[PDB]
Amino acid sequence: GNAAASVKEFLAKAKEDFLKKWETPSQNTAQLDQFDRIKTLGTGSFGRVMLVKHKESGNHYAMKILDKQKVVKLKQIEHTLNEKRILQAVNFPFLVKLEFSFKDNSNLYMVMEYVAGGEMFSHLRRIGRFSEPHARFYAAQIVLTFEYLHSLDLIYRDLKPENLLIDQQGYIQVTDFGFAKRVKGRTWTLCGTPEALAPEIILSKGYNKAVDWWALGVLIYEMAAGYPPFFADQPIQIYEKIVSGKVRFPSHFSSDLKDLLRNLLQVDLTKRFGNLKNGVNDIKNHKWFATTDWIAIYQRKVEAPFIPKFKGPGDTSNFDDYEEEEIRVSINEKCGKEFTEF
Amino acid sequence: TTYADFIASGRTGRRNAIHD
Numbered sequence: 074g075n076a077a078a079s080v081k082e083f084l085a086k087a088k089e090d091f092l093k094k095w096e097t098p099s100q101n102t103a104q105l106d107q108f109d110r111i112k113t114l115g116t117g118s119f120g121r122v123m124l125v126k127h128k129e130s131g132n133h134y135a136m137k138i139l140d141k142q143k144v145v146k147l148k149q150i151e152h153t154l155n156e157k158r159i160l161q162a163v164n165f166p167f168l169v170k171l172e173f174s175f176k177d178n179s180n181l182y183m184v185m186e187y188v189a190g191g192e193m194f195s196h197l198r199r200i201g202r203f204s205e206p207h208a209r210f211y212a213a214q215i216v217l218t219f220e221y222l223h224s225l226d227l228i229y230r231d232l233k234p235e236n237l238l239i240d241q242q243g244y245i246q247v248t249d250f251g252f253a254k255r256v257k258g259r260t261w262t263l264c265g266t267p268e269a270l271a272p273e274i275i276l277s278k279g280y281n282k283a284v285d286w287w288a289l290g291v292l293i294y295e296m297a298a299g300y301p302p303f304f305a306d307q308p309i310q311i312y313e314k315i316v317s318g319k320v321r322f323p324s325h326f327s328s329d330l331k332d333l334l335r336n337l338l339q340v341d342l343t344k345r346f347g348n349l350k351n352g353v354n355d356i357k358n359h360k361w362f363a364t365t366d367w368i369a370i371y372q373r374k375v376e377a378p379f380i381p382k383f384k385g386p387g388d389t390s391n392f393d394d395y396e397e398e399e400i401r402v403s404i405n406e407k408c409g410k411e412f413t414e415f
Numbered sequence: 416t417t418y419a420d421f422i423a424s425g426r427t428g429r430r431n432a433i434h435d
């Protein structure tokens with residue numbers, strides 16, 4: 074996301090900027106034959122993201138390809154429209170930039186900045202766990218990003234290391250807006266990733282942006298422990314644990330970290346941090362963040378825990394290898410009406 | 416250990432979203 078150029082004033086301008094783009098989204102800003110597709114960077118439950126080279130500029134990008142028929146099969150039409158409409162409208166240092174979008178007969182395409190440092194996930198699993206200062210550095214960026222997104226009436230709904238990328242300065246970029254939604258009241262969809270679901274999602278109650286603050290508790294736990302607070306071999310066993318909501322902490326967790334996590338991983342919405350009278354400030358002013366200079370994080374002035382190794386603009390060494398598949402495009406348009414606004 | 420139990424589990428790799 075673009076680098077930094079009162080907080081109430083900042084957020085007011087940010088909302089004006091967002092709403093102009095929300096109300097009149099960008100469409101059709103590239104086409105498939107403007108890019109050479111090189112290699113898959115990642116797949117998720119819905120799309121495939123490829124490293125591509127834009128021919129006329131020589132620039133590399135990360136192209137998310139969604140098969141329209143798969144989107145329909147998995148009941149993701151509205152979610153995918155949400156994803157693109159929101160991502161084209163947002164602007165924050167720790168959000169991946171959508172550079173182009175377009176569609177063809179078969180697929181939807183979201184061409185992002187290529188964030189070359191890899192998923193946080195891979196680094197996390199390899200090293201085992203992050204130190205508290207390292208975890209805190211990443212967590213601060215998510216706190217600020219959620220303050221931004223929630224101010225726009227957005228809920229993010231898929232926070233996990235697989236959807237967080239490390240950039241060339243060692244800062245985070247959030248990707249995968251697939252479950253992001255602009256909502257002023259509560260919402261009901263069962264979506265996310267099992268380990269990160271708040272209890273109120275699992276219990277079908279109706280929920281709001283507090284589920285993102287829960288998920289931040291899960292992320293901070295997982296970064297600092299190396300495993301999630303609620304794990305099992307199958308999702309249903311995870312849900313039981315979440316709803317039990319007893320949390321146990323590693324021996325090495327600081328008292329401050331445990332206290333913060335008890336307040337984020339809080340089943341009682343009247344007590345969950347992020348969800349109280351003082352909003353995000355209960356988190357920012359928590360003892361675990363006492364060392365965090367919030368403005369310096371926003372300005373990317375804090376020294377990063379590590380800068381990924383980068384050997385040229387098309388280097389993918391920080392990403393796992395994936396099986397490749399042909400990108401088919403039918404001579405017949407699929408799902409034209411459904412995706413008219415994309 | 417909790418770590419050993421996690422590592423021996425089936426969910427140490429990249430996790431899929433759930434929906435529907």
Ligand SMILES: Nc1ncnc2c1ncn2[C@@H]1O[C@H](COP(=O)(O)OP(=O)(O)OP(=O)(O)O)[C@@H](O)[C@H]1O
Nearest residue numbers: 115117118119120122135185188235248249251432
């Ligand atoms: N801008 C990017 N630069 C580099 N790699 C990226 C970028 N965006 C996404 N990726 C990679 O592609 C993967 C899939 O992208 P994304 O998470 O958006 O797909 P998805 O199908 O919606 O995944 P999910 O199962 O979480 O819903 C990411 O986990 C990451 O490895």
Ligand SMILES: [Mg+2]
Nearest residue numbers: 117235236249
């Ligand atoms: Mg994803």
Ligand SMILES: [Mg+2]
Nearest residue numbers: 117249251252
């Ligand atoms: Mg997704």
